[PDB]
Design a protein around this ligand. Structure first.
Ligand SMILES: Cc1cc2c(cc1-c1cc3cc(C(=O)O)c(=O)oc3cc1O)C(C)(C)CCC2(C)C
Lengths: 200, 195, 193, 203
């Protein structure tokens, strides 16, 4: 189904942990509204969210950032701020490889939902009790996305593959965001500097 | 053994360039861009090749020299994790769906034609050639495996795995730790016992 | 469990600022430079503290929560943990590194003139010279029988640097304590309405 | 004395050619190590471990020091300007070599005896994994840095802090060390254009 994925998509310094907690929770609420996700073992649900949270978050804010130049919306962080916090390279990749590609092809929210659902339903995730079941749910999602794309954009016969071929970029940007601690430098950066200037 | 590795590398790079030149329209790109695509691509292209070659082998990979490497050796050289990912995420997935050599070729051609490669003079042209390749692959899949309507997507969805395994092979120096470990010890000793 | 870690971090950062301000001449640096030194230094400063605390423990580190190397190897960070033990904790034990000597090393680490963005690196270098001049005085007087003790102290800093970067790169702290707390978090979220 | 350390210090197919350059460089490094007192008296297993543990920092220390006689470049005989380094995608690491090592060595006029002794300290690293007798390596490192302090106190008595200043370049050497591994710094520098030149065998 493609209607419940779009429906899902539409619906003290270190205590940066609170902001993180709230962000992760938004992500869990979304996952629970993806058909069949909540019918997986609880251990498997946790593994998929642990495996997925980084790429899922980047996909969200990348897409939000379509409405913005040389920035991402969380609110608004300009690329000059990102370069200043020593994560310029990774930020520019988000812009060129994700945000602009999403803009150029006017990726809609149903299509974002389905990609995120493919990422979430990752049968490669380590420790999954039944990877075959996860694979099966991902097949349902991308079968459903192809149906949606063929109907809404029949003039764009390549559109389905183009969507799927943004996932490799998402994966590498994924790993670079972990490795550079991208999320926690973005929200945590100045709050820390501001805290520390309690040496005044 | 060290001289073998360096020759094998040279031969592999050469094989890789000859292959790329025989991909339609590749040689019609700017020369700067051809170099960028091969330099951006050689890691994933090589892993795709040997992963697929390794379909015909249990708990191992075959390298295009002939050199079979079992996972026992890989875990012994302290790259067990990365080796197991190659096996589970690539080799077995390729086996399970019986990925044929046409389908490997088209994926390698998609990887080669990477319009995200840094410094490309005309990314739009590279993107255009990748569209031709994956349009051609979908045609092939729909006709040879009409019973498997999801086969095209399944092929494309091995590329993220290839990307991460790609970066992990760089980051761990996967190739050099596999074959190069004791050859280096042997090298250094030869140098140490020389005058 | 997660809430506790985040509080402990906040408390650690605070302890760290109070400490730095009580280092002579630190507070006489530009505010921009003070922030840079603490941001550049917090990782090595913390590892130096808990490494030294862990002298009183076998095959473990003390952070109140004792962490045994069996748990560390089980959480896939055995390599980094063993480096902390062999290169820092045991070396500190073997030479009976005292708390004055730890303080001076931490002060040398803090006064890092290599820190990027420093307005006046020459001033930071000058304060580090004062610190390590002071440490040599201390070493030569308390351990005159150990004429190489000063150099030995300074030659633990490279280890501190590499273990520093390896702890960042592996997310050493988060994988140690944060593993199951995260699983527990996500379940809390999953069984919420 | 520390004369033997200074004496030590004052001595188509694109991948194959990089490998030859590497081979030659590593060999110069072994010849140097053999002329360090007591090194050749270690077990052969231990000698191999120290060179395996050490080669990256030892090489960087050499070329950093050689590069004192050069602006916004490093000397390997092939001078490499920072423009080329930034072009080969290793600009960050190159700038660190310049700021943290080359300029610091220039500013304090580090001489070749002092470089030798630091390299000898790096070589005699008792933290190296698998050493048969790390106590012996530690003992040789103590001899080296005891000898360096003697040299510094005599040649630069006006600079009482010069010994510590020398030793406190080693952390920088370590981090630049790990960054050079992680980026494959050496092989991108020497291997860079040879590859580009090879590949431009498209016609
Ligand atoms: C020991 C060692 C050193 C290095 C490297 C790797 C190792 C290295 C050596 C062994 C030997 C081994 C052996 O003695 O059989 C082993 O099992 O695992 C190793 C793992 C390693 O990472 C790389 C490839 C990262 C290049 C940089 C240097 C420092 C030369």
């Amino acid at each position: 189904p493609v209607e419940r994925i779009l429906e899902a998509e539409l619906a003290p310094v270190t205590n940066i942990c609170q902001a993180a907690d709230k962000q992760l929770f938004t992500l869990v609420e979304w996952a629970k509204r993806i058909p069949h996700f909540s019918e997986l073992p609880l251990d498997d649900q946790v593994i998929l969210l642990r495996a997925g949270w980084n790429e899922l978050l980047i996909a969200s804010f990348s897409h939000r950032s379509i409405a913005v130049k040389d920035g991402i919306l969380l609110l608004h962080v300009h690329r000059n701020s990102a370069h200043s916090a020593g994560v310029g390279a990774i930020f520019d990749r988000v812009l060129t490889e994700l945000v602009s590609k999403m803009r150029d092809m006017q990726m809609d929210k149903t299509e974002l939902g389905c990609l995120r659902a493919i990422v979430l339903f990752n049968p490669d995730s380590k420790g999954l009790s039944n990877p075959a079941e996860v694979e099966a749910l991902r097949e349902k999602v991308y079968a459903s996305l192809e149906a949606y794309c063929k109907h809404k954009y029949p003039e764009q016969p390549g559109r389905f593959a183009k969507l799927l071929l943004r996932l490799p970029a998402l994966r590498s940007i994924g790993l670079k965001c972990l490795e550079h601690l991208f999320f926690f430098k973005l929200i945590g950066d100045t709050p820390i500097d501001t805290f520390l200037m309690e040496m005044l």
